Amino acid sequence: HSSGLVPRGSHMSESVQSNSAVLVHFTLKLDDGTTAESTRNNGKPALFRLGDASLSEGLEQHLLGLKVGDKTTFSLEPDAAFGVPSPDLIQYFSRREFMDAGEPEIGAIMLFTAMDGSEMPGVIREINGDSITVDFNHPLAGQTVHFDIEVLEIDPALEA
């Protein structure tokens, strides 16, 4: 063998792979310095799963190769992060469709049920009589995002 290939010592991956589940701490900040999301704020670490389109490819590319205990800080522009916002994700509802959901209020985040029963938040953008405008774009669409990520564990095992 001429590869530099080495049998892996550990029972689990030693560095993040294309399909790893990764327990992390993270902070995600916007250009103005505000914190959009933090594991501190959530109260607990997050599970980042590579290889199933739950993460952007740009985030995945910065996680690949990291080992437990590694910290990385980096920024992503929208095309590598949460994309730019699309006018197609602005949608129109009748006020009566909110009959059981709560009064629409400008700027509120409301939850909506999709056809397959998964839930999606939407932000109330306009209220004009019977017509309610809702924006379903990702909340961080269009933003440059600043990540600070620390790898806690790779492929955590089920507990007995």
Coordinates of N, CA and C in Angstrom, one line a residue:
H1 N 0.8 -1.3 0.0 CA 0.0 0.0 0.0 C 0.8 1.4 0.0
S2 N 0.5 2.2 -0.9 CA 1.3 3.4 -1.2 C 0.4 4.6 -0.9
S3 N -0.7 4.4 -0.1 CA -1.6 5.4 -0.1 C -1.5 6.4 1.1
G4 N -0.7 6.1 2.2 CA -0.8 6.8 3.4 C -2.1 6.3 4.2
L5 N -2.7 5.3 3.7 CA -3.9 4.7 4.3 C -3.5 4.1 5.7
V6 N -4.3 4.4 6.7 CA -4.0 3.9 8.1 C -5.2 3.3 8.6
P7 N -5.2 2.1 9.2 CA -6.4 1.6 9.8 C -6.9 2.5 10.9
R8 N -8.2 2.8 10.9 CA -8.7 3.7 11.9 C -8.7 3.1 13.3
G9 N -8.2 3.9 14.3 CA -8.1 3.4 15.7 C -9.4 3.3 16.4
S10 N -10.2 4.3 16.3 CA -11.4 4.5 17.0 C -12.6 3.7 16.5
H11 N -13.6 3.5 17.4 CA -14.8 2.9 17.0 C -15.8 3.7 16.2
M12 N -15.6 5.0 16.2 CA -16.4 6.0 15.5 C -15.5 6.8 14.6
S13 N -16.0 7.5 13.7 CA -15.2 8.4 12.8 C -14.4 9.3 13.7
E14 N -13.2 9.5 13.3 CA -12.3 10.4 14.0 C -12.4 11.9 13.5
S15 N -12.8 12.0 12.2 CA -13.0 13.4 11.7 C -14.3 13.3 11.0
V16 N -14.9 14.5 10.7 CA -16.3 14.6 10.1 C -16.2 14.1 8.7
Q17 N -17.1 13.2 8.4 CA -17.3 12.6 7.0 C -18.5 13.1 6.4
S18 N -18.7 12.7 5.1 CA -19.7 13.2 4.2 C -21.1 12.9 4.8
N19 N -21.3 11.8 5.6 CA -22.5 11.4 6.2 C -22.6 11.4 7.7
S20 N -21.6 12.1 8.3 CA -21.6 12.1 9.8 C -22.8 12.9 10.4
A21 N -23.2 12.4 11.6 CA -24.0 13.1 12.5 C -23.0 13.8 13.5
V22 N -23.2 15.1 13.7 CA -22.2 15.8 14.5 C -22.9 16.6 15.5
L23 N -22.6 16.4 16.8 CA -23.0 17.2 17.9 C -22.1 18.4 18.0
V24 N -22.7 19.6 18.0 CA -21.9 20.8 18.0 C -22.5 21.8 19.0
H25 N -21.6 22.7 19.5 CA -22.0 24.0 19.9 C -21.8 25.0 18.8
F26 N -22.8 26.0 18.6 CA -22.5 27.0 17.6 C -23.2 28.3 17.9
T27 N -22.6 29.3 17.3 CA -23.3 30.7 17.3 C -23.3 31.1 15.9
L28 N -24.4 31.7 15.5 CA -24.5 32.2 14.1 C -24.9 33.7 14.2
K29 N -24.0 34.6 13.7 CA -24.2 36.0 13.8 C -24.4 36.7 12.4
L30 N -25.1 37.8 12.4 CA -25.4 38.6 11.2 C -24.3 39.7 11.1
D31 N -24.3 40.3 9.9 CA -23.3 41.4 9.6 C -23.3 42.5 10.7
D32 N -24.5 42.8 11.3 CA -24.6 43.8 12.3 C -24.1 43.4 13.7
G33 N -23.6 42.1 13.8 CA -23.1 41.6 15.1 C -24.2 41.0 15.9
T34 N -25.4 40.9 15.5 CA -26.4 40.3 16.3 C -26.4 38.8 16.2
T35 N -26.7 38.1 17.3 CA -26.8 36.7 17.2 C -28.2 36.1 16.8
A36 N -28.2 35.4 15.6 CA -29.4 34.9 15.1 C -29.8 33.6 15.8
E37 N -28.8 32.8 16.1 CA -29.1 31.5 16.7 C -27.9 31.1 17.4
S38 N -28.0 30.4 18.5 CA -26.9 29.9 19.4 C -27.3 28.7 20.1
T39 N -26.5 27.7 20.3 CA -26.8 26.6 21.1 C -26.8 27.1 22.6
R40 N -26.1 28.1 23.0 CA -26.3 28.7 24.3 C -27.7 29.1 24.6
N41 N -28.3 29.8 23.5 CA -29.6 30.4 23.6 C -30.6 29.3 23.6
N42 N -30.4 28.2 22.9 CA -31.3 27.1 22.8 C -31.3 26.3 24.1
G43 N -30.2 26.4 24.9 CA -30.1 25.6 26.1 C -29.4 24.2 25.9
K44 N -29.0 23.8 24.7 CA -28.4 22.5 24.5 C -27.7 22.4 23.2
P45 N -26.8 21.5 23.0 CA -26.1 21.3 21.7 C -27.0 20.9 20.6
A46 N -26.5 21.2 19.4 CA -27.3 20.8 18.2 C -26.7 19.7 17.4
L47 N -27.6 18.9 16.8 CA -27.1 17.8 15.9 C -27.1 18.3 14.5
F48 N -26.0 18.3 13.8 CA -25.8 18.7 12.4 C -25.5 17.4 11.6
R49 N -26.4 17.1 10.7 CA -26.3 15.9 10.0 C -25.8 16.2 8.5
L50 N -24.6 15.7 8.1 CA -24.1 16.0 6.8 C -24.8 14.9 5.8
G51 N -24.9 15.3 4.6 CA -25.3 14.4 3.5 C -26.7 14.1 3.3
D52 N -27.6 14.9 3.9 CA -29.0 14.7 3.6 C -29.7 16.0 3.2
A53 N -29.0 17.0 2.8 CA -29.5 18.3 2.4 C -30.2 19.0 3.5
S54 N -29.9 18.7 4.7 CA -30.4 19.5 5.9 C -29.5 20.7 6.2
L55 N -28.2 20.6 5.8 CA -27.2 21.7 5.9 C -26.9 22.2 4.6
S56 N -26.5 23.4 4.4 CA -26.0 23.9 3.1 C -24.7 23.2 2.7
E57 N -24.4 23.1 1.4 CA -23.2 22.5 1.1 C -22.0 23.4 1.6
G58 N -22.2 24.7 1.7 CA -21.1 25.6 2.2 C -20.8 25.3 3.6
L59 N -21.8 25.0 4.4 CA -21.6 24.7 5.9 C -20.9 23.3 5.9
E60 N -21.5 22.4 5.1 CA -20.8 21.0 5.1 C -19.4 21.1 4.8
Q61 N -19.0 21.9 3.8 CA -17.6 21.9 3.4 C -16.7 22.4 4.5
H62 N -17.1 23.3 5.4 CA -16.4 23.8 6.6 C -16.4 22.8 7.7
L63 N -17.3 21.8 7.7 CA -17.4 20.8 8.8 C -16.5 19.6 8.4
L64 N -16.4 19.2 7.1 CA -15.6 18.0 6.7 C -14.2 18.1 7.2
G65 N -13.8 17.0 7.8 CA -12.4 16.9 8.3 C -12.2 17.4 9.7
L66 N -13.1 18.1 10.3 CA -13.0 18.5 11.7 C -13.0 17.4 12.7
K67 N -12.2 17.4 13.7 CA -12.1 16.4 14.8 C -12.8 16.9 16.0
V68 N -13.2 16.0 16.9 CA -13.7 16.4 18.3 C -12.7 17.4 18.9
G69 N -13.3 18.5 19.4 CA -12.5 19.5 20.1 C -12.1 20.7 19.2
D70 N -12.3 20.5 17.9 CA -11.9 21.6 16.9 C -13.0 22.7 17.0
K71 N -12.5 23.9 16.9 CA -13.4 25.1 16.9 C -13.1 25.7 15.5
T72 N -14.1 26.2 14.8 CA -13.9 26.9 13.6 C -14.8 28.1 13.6
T73 N -14.3 29.2 13.0 CA -15.0 30.4 12.8 C -14.9 30.8 11.3
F74 N -16.0 31.1 10.6 CA -15.9 31.4 9.2 C -17.2 32.1 8.8
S75 N -17.2 32.8 7.7 CA -18.4 33.4 7.2 C -18.8 32.8 5.9
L76 N -20.1 32.8 5.6 CA -20.7 32.4 4.3 C -21.6 33.4 3.7
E77 N -21.5 33.6 2.4 CA -22.4 34.5 1.7 C -23.6 33.7 1.4
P78 N -24.8 34.4 1.0 CA -26.0 33.6 0.8 C -25.9 32.4 -0.1
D79 N -25.2 32.5 -1.2 CA -25.2 31.4 -2.1 C -24.7 30.1 -1.5
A80 N -23.8 30.2 -0.5 CA -23.3 29.1 0.2 C -24.0 28.8 1.6
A81 N -24.8 29.7 2.0 CA -25.5 29.7 3.3 C -27.0 29.3 3.0
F82 N -27.9 30.3 3.2 CA -29.3 30.0 3.2 C -30.0 30.5 1.9
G83 N -29.2 30.9 0.9 CA -29.6 31.4 -0.4 C -30.3 32.7 -0.3
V84 N -30.5 33.3 -1.4 CA -31.2 34.6 -1.5 C -32.7 34.4 -1.5
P85 N -33.4 35.4 -1.0 CA -34.9 35.2 -0.9 C -35.5 35.2 -2.3
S86 N -36.6 34.5 -2.4 CA -37.3 34.4 -3.6 C -38.7 34.9 -3.5
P87 N -39.2 35.7 -4.5 CA -40.5 36.2 -4.5 C -41.6 35.2 -4.6
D88 N -41.2 34.0 -5.0 CA -42.1 32.8 -5.2 C -42.6 32.3 -3.8
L89 N -41.8 32.6 -2.8 CA -42.1 32.2 -1.4 C -42.9 33.2 -0.6
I90 N -43.4 34.3 -1.3 CA -44.3 35.2 -0.8 C -45.7 34.7 -1.2
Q91 N -46.6 34.5 -0.3 CA -47.9 33.9 -0.6 C -49.0 34.6 0.1
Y92 N -50.2 34.5 -0.5 CA -51.4 35.2 -0.1 C -52.4 34.3 0.6
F93 N -53.0 34.7 1.7 CA -54.0 34.0 2.5 C -55.2 34.9 2.7
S94 N -56.4 34.4 2.8 CA -57.5 35.1 3.3 C -57.5 35.2 4.8
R95 N -57.9 36.3 5.3 CA -58.1 36.4 6.8 C -58.9 35.3 7.4
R96 N -59.9 34.8 6.7 CA -60.7 33.7 7.3 C -60.0 32.4 7.5
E97 N -58.9 32.2 6.7 CA -58.0 31.0 6.9 C -57.4 30.9 8.2
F98 N -57.3 32.0 8.9 CA -56.7 32.1 10.3 C -57.8 32.0 11.4
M99 N -59.0 31.7 11.0 CA -60.1 31.5 11.9 C -59.7 30.7 13.2
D100 N -59.0 29.7 13.2 CA -58.5 28.9 14.4 C -57.1 29.1 14.8
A101 N -56.3 29.9 14.1 CA -54.9 29.9 14.3 C -54.4 31.1 15.1
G102 N -55.3 32.1 15.4 CA -54.7 33.3 16.0 C -54.7 34.4 15.0
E103 N -55.0 35.6 15.5 CA -55.1 36.8 14.7 C -53.7 37.1 14.1
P104 N -53.7 37.2 12.7 CA -52.5 37.7 12.1 C -52.1 39.1 12.6
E105 N -50.8 39.3 12.9 CA -50.3 40.6 13.3 C -49.0 40.8 12.5
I106 N -48.8 42.1 12.1 CA -47.6 42.4 11.2 C -46.3 41.9 11.8
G107 N -45.5 41.2 11.1 CA -44.2 40.9 11.6 C -44.2 39.6 12.4
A108 N -45.4 39.1 12.8 CA -45.5 37.8 13.6 C -45.0 36.6 12.8
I109 N -44.4 35.7 13.5 CA -44.1 34.4 12.9 C -45.2 33.4 13.2
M110 N -45.9 32.8 12.2 CA -46.9 31.9 12.5 C -46.5 30.6 11.8
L111 N -47.0 29.5 12.4 CA -46.7 28.1 11.9 C -47.9 27.7 11.0
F112 N -47.5 27.1 9.9 CA -48.4 26.6 8.9 C -48.1 25.1 8.7
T113 N -49.2 24.3 8.4 CA -49.1 22.9 8.1 C -49.0 22.7 6.5
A114 N -48.0 22.0 6.1 CA -47.9 21.7 4.6 C -48.7 20.4 4.3
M115 N -48.8 20.1 3.0 CA -49.6 19.0 2.6 C -49.1 17.7 3.3
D116 N -47.9 17.5 3.4 CA -47.4 16.2 4.1 C -47.5 16.3 5.6
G117 N -48.0 17.4 6.2 CA -48.2 17.5 7.6 C -47.0 18.1 8.3
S118 N -45.9 18.3 7.6 CA -44.7 19.1 8.3 C -45.1 20.5 8.4
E119 N -44.5 21.2 9.4 CA -44.8 22.5 9.7 C -43.8 23.5 9.2
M120 N -44.2 24.6 8.8 CA -43.3 25.6 8.3 C -43.6 27.0 8.9
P121 N -42.6 27.7 9.4 CA -43.0 29.1 9.8 C -43.1 30.0 8.6
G122 N -43.9 31.0 8.7 CA -44.1 32.1 7.8 C -44.2 33.4 8.5
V123 N -43.7 34.5 7.9 CA -43.8 35.8 8.7 C -44.9 36.6 8.0
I124 N -45.7 37.2 8.8 CA -46.8 38.1 8.3 C -46.2 39.4 7.7
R125 N -46.3 39.6 6.4 CA -45.6 40.8 5.7 C -46.5 41.9 5.5
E126 N -47.8 41.6 5.3 CA -48.8 42.7 5.0 C -50.2 42.2 5.5
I127 N -51.0 43.1 5.9 CA -52.3 42.8 6.3 C -53.2 43.9 5.7
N128 N -54.1 43.5 4.8 CA -54.9 44.5 4.0 C -56.2 44.0 3.8
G129 N -57.1 44.2 4.9 CA -58.4 43.7 4.8 C -58.5 42.2 5.0
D130 N -59.2 41.6 4.0 CA -59.2 40.1 4.0 C -57.8 39.6 3.5
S131 N -57.0 40.3 2.8 CA -55.7 39.7 2.2 C -54.5 39.8 3.2
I132 N -54.0 38.6 3.5 CA -52.8 38.5 4.4 C -51.6 38.0 3.5
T133 N -50.5 38.7 3.6 CA -49.3 38.3 2.8 C -48.3 37.7 3.7
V134 N -47.8 36.5 3.4 CA -46.9 35.7 4.3 C -45.7 35.4 3.5
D135 N -44.5 35.6 4.2 CA -43.2 35.2 3.6 C -42.7 33.9 4.2
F136 N -42.5 32.9 3.3 CA -42.0 31.6 3.7 C -40.5 31.4 3.5
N137 N -39.8 32.5 3.0 CA -38.4 32.3 2.8 C -37.7 32.0 4.2
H138 N -36.6 31.3 4.1 CA -35.8 31.0 5.2 C -35.5 32.3 5.9
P139 N -35.6 32.3 7.3 CA -35.3 33.6 8.0 C -34.0 34.2 7.7
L140 N -33.0 33.4 7.3 CA -31.7 34.0 7.1 C -31.4 34.1 5.6
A141 N -32.4 34.0 4.7 CA -32.2 34.1 3.3 C -31.6 35.6 3.1
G142 N -30.7 35.7 2.2 CA -30.1 37.0 1.8 C -29.0 37.5 2.7
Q143 N -28.8 36.9 3.9 CA -27.8 37.4 4.8 C -26.5 36.7 4.6
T144 N -25.4 37.4 4.7 CA -24.1 36.8 5.1 C -24.1 36.4 6.5
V145 N -23.6 35.2 6.8 CA -23.7 34.6 8.1 C -22.4 34.3 8.6
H146 N -22.2 34.5 9.9 CA -20.9 34.3 10.6 C -21.1 33.2 11.6
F147 N -20.3 32.1 11.4 CA -20.5 30.9 12.2 C -19.3 30.7 13.1
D148 N -19.6 30.3 14.3 CA -18.5 29.8 15.3 C -19.0 28.4 15.7
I149 N -18.3 27.4 15.4 CA -18.7 26.0 15.6 C -17.7 25.2 16.4
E150 N -18.1 24.5 17.4 CA -17.2 23.6 18.1 C -17.7 22.2 18.0
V151 N -16.9 21.2 17.6 CA -17.3 19.8 17.4 C -17.3 19.1 18.7
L152 N -18.4 18.5 19.1 CA -18.4 17.9 20.5 C -18.3 16.4 20.3
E153 N -18.9 15.8 19.3 CA -19.0 14.4 19.2 C -19.3 14.1 17.7
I154 N -18.8 13.0 17.2 CA -19.2 12.5 15.9 C -19.8 11.1 16.0
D155 N -21.0 11.0 15.4 CA -21.8 9.8 15.4 C -22.1 9.3 16.8
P156 N -22.8 10.1 17.6 CA -23.1 9.6 19.0 C -23.9 8.4 19.0
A157 N -23.7 7.5 19.9 CA -24.3 6.2 19.9 C -25.6 6.2 20.6
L158 N -26.6 5.3 20.3 CA -27.8 5.2 21.1 C -27.4 4.8 22.5
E159 N -28.2 5.2 23.5 CA -28.0 4.7 24.8 C -28.9 3.5 25.2
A160 N -28.4 2.7 26.1 CA -29.2 1.6 26.6 C -30.3 2.3 27.4

